[PDB]
Ligand binder design. Structure first.
Ligand SMILES: Cc1cc2nc3c(=O)[nH]c(=O)nc-3n(C[C@H](O)[C@H](O)[C@H](O)COP(=O)(O)OP(=O)(O)OC[C@H]3O[C@@H](n4cnc5c(N)ncnc54)[C@H](O)[C@@H]3O)c2cc1C
Ligand SMILES: Cc1cc2nc3c(=O)[nH]c(=O)nc-3n(C[C@H](O)[C@H](O)[C@H](O)COP(=O)(O)OP(=O)(O)OC[C@H]3O[C@@H](n4cnc5c(N)ncnc54)[C@H](O)[C@@H]3O)c2cc1C
Lengths: 101, 100
C-alpha cells in the first residue's frame, strides 16, 4: 500500500495547500515553523532517495518564508527541480495560486 | 480546488507513512524531529478549527516517539480520536502496519 508516488502526491498537496494558507505578513514563529518543517522533511521524508534530493535542494535553495508569495513560489521551484529530475512537466510558478487556493 | 477532506487524507497518508518508516531505535534527533513535527502541525495545519482541535489532543496526549511501534500506535490513537469526533468509523490500532 502507498507507493513512492502516492506519498509524493499526498505530501505535495499538504505542502502546497500549506503555502496557499501561509500569511501575507507571517509572525516570527510561523516563519520559524515553516523553515523547521522543511528541515525536518529533509531528514524524515519516508522515501530514502527522495529525502536525500530534498536535502540537497534545501541546502542550495533555502526556504523563502518571508511571505505567502515567497513561500508559494519557493515550494513550486523546489517541486519543479524534482519534476525536472524525473522527466516530468515543469509547472509555471505564476499559477501556483490558481492551482492551490 | 483542494477540500478540507483531501487535505486530511493527504496529511494522514504522509503522517502514517512517516510513522511506518520511523526506526525501531530512533536517535535523539529523530525523536526530537518527530515531536516538533506534531507541534508544528498543531499551529500550522491549514483548516483553522482543525488546528485548534489537534492542539488540544496533543496537549493531553503528547507524542510518543521511543520507537516505530510506539509512534505508529500513538499516531493511530490520535487519529481515531479525530475520526470519533467527526462521526467516522474507528480503526482498530493493531492494523496500522496494514493500511501503511
Ligand atoms: C519533498 C518531496 C521530495 C520528492 N522527491 C523525489 C525523488 O527524489 N525521486 C522520486 O522518484 N520521487 C520523488 N518525490 C515524488 C514525486 O515528486 C512525485 O510526487 C511522484 O512522482 C508523482 O508525480 P505526479 O506526476 O503524480 O505529480 P506530483 O509531482 O506528485 O504532483 C502533485 C500535482 O500537483 C501539481 N503540481 C506539479 N508541479 C507543481 C508545482 N511546481 N507547484 C504546485 N503544484 C505542482 C499537479 O497538479 C500535479 O499533478 C518527492 C515528493 C516530495 C513531496
Ligand atoms: C492532524 C489532523 C487534524 C484534523 N482535524 C480535523 C478537524 O478538526 N475537522 C475536520 O472537519 N477535519 C479534520 N481533519 C480532517 C479529517 O480527519 C479527514 O482527513 C477528512 O475528513 C477525510 O476523511 P476520510 O474519511 O477520507 O479519512 P481520514 O480520516 O482522512 O483517513 C485516512 C484513511 O486512513 C485510514 N485510517 C482511519 N482512521 C485511522 C487510524 N485511526 N489510524 C490509521 N489509519 C486510519 C483509513 O484507511 C482511511 O480511509 C484533520 C486531519 C489531520 C491530518
Amino acid at each position: 500500500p502507498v507507493t513512492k508516488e502516492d506519498l509524493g502526491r499526498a505530501t505535495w498537496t499538504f505542502l502546497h495547500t500549506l503555502a496557499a494558507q501561509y500569511p501575507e505578513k507571517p509572525t516570527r514563529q510561523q516563519k520559524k515553523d515553516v523553515k523547521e518543517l522543511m528541515t525536518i522533511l529533509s531528514r524524515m521524508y519516508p522515501c530514502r532517495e527522495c529525502a536525500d534530493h530534498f536535502k540537497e535542494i534545501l541546502r542550495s535553495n533555502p526556504a523563502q518564508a518571508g511571505s505567502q508569495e515567497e513561500f508559494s513560489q519557493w515550494l513550486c521551484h523546489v517541486h519543479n527541480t524534482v519534476n525536472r529530475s524525473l522527466g516530468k512537466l515543469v509547472f509555471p510558478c505564476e499559477r501556483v495560486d490558481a492551482r492551490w487556493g
